[PDB]
């Protein structure tokens, strides 16, 4: 039970309800359920480092009200 | 539940790129 934000490069803010034990893949999967964005296109950055899918929020000290930066591998022609 | 991809629009592209 925690509230954390996820900020895109355009300034859009998404609020997520997570647990400190949840993994980064759970965060990506939560982003997909709220903004419809496929997790394969998602990259999460905290404290200047890209988060690995296998680690948890407690490992990166992602405290309540921390802001995650979402960078997307864009589809283009 | 519908799923929407992240996308970008091509403004300009050099001909050498193919």
């Amino acid at each position: 039970s925690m509230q954390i934000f996820v900020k895109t490069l355009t300034g859009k803010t998404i609020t997520l309800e997570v647990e400190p034990s949840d993994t980064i893949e759970n965060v990506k999967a939560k982003i997909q359920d709220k903004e419809g964005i496929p997790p394969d296109q998602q990259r999460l950055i905290f404290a200047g480092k890209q988060l690995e899918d296998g680690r948890t929020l407690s490992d990166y000290n992602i405290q309540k009200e921390s802001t995650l930066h979402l960078v997307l591998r864009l589809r283009g022609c | 539940r519908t799923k929407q991809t992240a996308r970008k629009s091509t403004g300009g592209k050099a001909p050498r790129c193919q």
Partner: protein
């Protein structure tokens, strides 16, 4: 009256701006190895932010990227202070100066979140760059470009949210939407869309192909003249 061999621009003509950059600046390859831009697949490519930027030909002439100098296959270089992709401060301090990026293989408009900013992106043969603020010497050339970027975002975002919306509703949405302060505009007009009708349609077409039967799209295109 002699033109540039690269950008076809008259040398005698005033308002012609030659690019200027600090002596601190370094080439593109040296910047991508700076630890302050490190955030740690090969198909995956680096992506950084670039503020206080300026675009110029090989002869040092500041060039617009609307004119079609990239479609003409003229090698356009650019410069600025690179920053990590997650930074929001558009101030040059905290960013690493760079000279002669590129050449520009492709420039694209990103960010259809509904968020406040529209994203402009440069693709080089070495890395990708999300642009922020143009340098104070390149702002006049980038002024006209900035409207096209945001107008395209308004249309694409409004079509995605309202696919059955009308052309009259589209003019309202554009006119109602308050322009950001970076545009230095008080309001959007129908003229703001009619001036770049060919461009907006070509942006929406590219957005649909990456992953256009709407009546407003049609009505627009027929009255667009394109």
């Amino acid at each position: 009256s002699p033109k540039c061999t690269e950008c076809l621009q008259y040398l005698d003509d005033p308002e012609l701006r030659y690019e200027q950059h600090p002596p601190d600046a370094v080439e593109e390859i040296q910047i991508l190895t700076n630890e302050r831009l490190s955030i740690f697949s090969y198909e995956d490519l680096p992506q950084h932010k670039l503020t206080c930027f300026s675009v110029y030909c090989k002869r040092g002439h500041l060039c617009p990227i609307d004119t079609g100098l990239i479609e003409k296959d003229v090698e356009l270089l650019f410069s600025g202070s690179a920053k990590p992709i997650y930074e929001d401060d558009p101030s040059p301090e905290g960013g690493i100066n760079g000279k002669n990026f590129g050449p520009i293989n492709e420039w694209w408009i990103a960010g259809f979140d509904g968020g406040e900013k529209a994203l402009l992106g440069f693709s080089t043969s070495f890395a990708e760059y999300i642009l922020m603020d143009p340098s104070p010497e390149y702002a006049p050339l980038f002024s006209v470009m900035q409207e096209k970027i945001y107008i395209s975002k308004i249309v694409v975002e409004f079509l995605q949210s309202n696919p059955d919306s009308t052309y009259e509703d589209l003019i309202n949405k554009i006119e109602t939407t308050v322009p950001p302060c970076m545009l230095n505009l008080n309001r959007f007009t129908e003229d703001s869309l009619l001036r770049h009708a060919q461009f907006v349609v070509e942006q929406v077409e590219s957005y649909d192909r990456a992953g256009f039967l709407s009546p407003c799209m049609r009505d627009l295109i027929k009255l667009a003249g394109v």
